[PDB]
Amino acid sequence: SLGPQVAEGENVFGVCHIFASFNDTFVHVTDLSGKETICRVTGGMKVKADRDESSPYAAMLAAQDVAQRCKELGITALHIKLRATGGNRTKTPGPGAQSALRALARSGMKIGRIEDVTPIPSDSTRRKGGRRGRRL
Template sequence: MDRLKGEQVDANLPSRFDYLLIYEYDIAERCKQVGNSALHVKLRATGGTETKTLGPGAQSALRALARSGMKIGRIEDVTSIPSDCTGRKKGRCGGRL
């Protein structure tokens, strides 16, 4: 996904995740041209001190890959999880306890 969102779609789409589907179909077409018919997928959320759950576009992106005829091998979650005491950002109002 080396292109910007504006190069693929208009700004007047009803859903903000529609451009992800367009990217997925584009990736599937490129893979078919090269000769790849199967993919291993790595999904990543923000991680760290932010949310560790995947966003709403992840499931629809996988569906788009499957619908376009690609075989999906492994689905791996590669979200970074801190192993130390990294603190969240705190505002002034609720940060003092």
């Protein structure tokens, strides 16, 4: 796999786009622009049980593979963008947010920056569940 012709003293910086919350974890490594991208792995692909897709180790096992293919190509460092679901929903990270970072960093990849990005309305449309909401 052909990387760029220098990366010896510099690094090449990708964006990691970690997805958060329940019943799902994505890790989707992209360009700086985000226009084009590389491999994309889910916790539903590592673990099949339909109930461990949000688990810590399923998120770790995902990033443990994705981080190999990064360095295989020539992407060595990562800026990080987070995404919790939002849009008048839970708007809080899942379990597999803390998890994937700890695994991918110690696999050998560099971390450049980290930030929160979540789609938060300035007040928008009514939430599913009705007036009385879920119970049981």
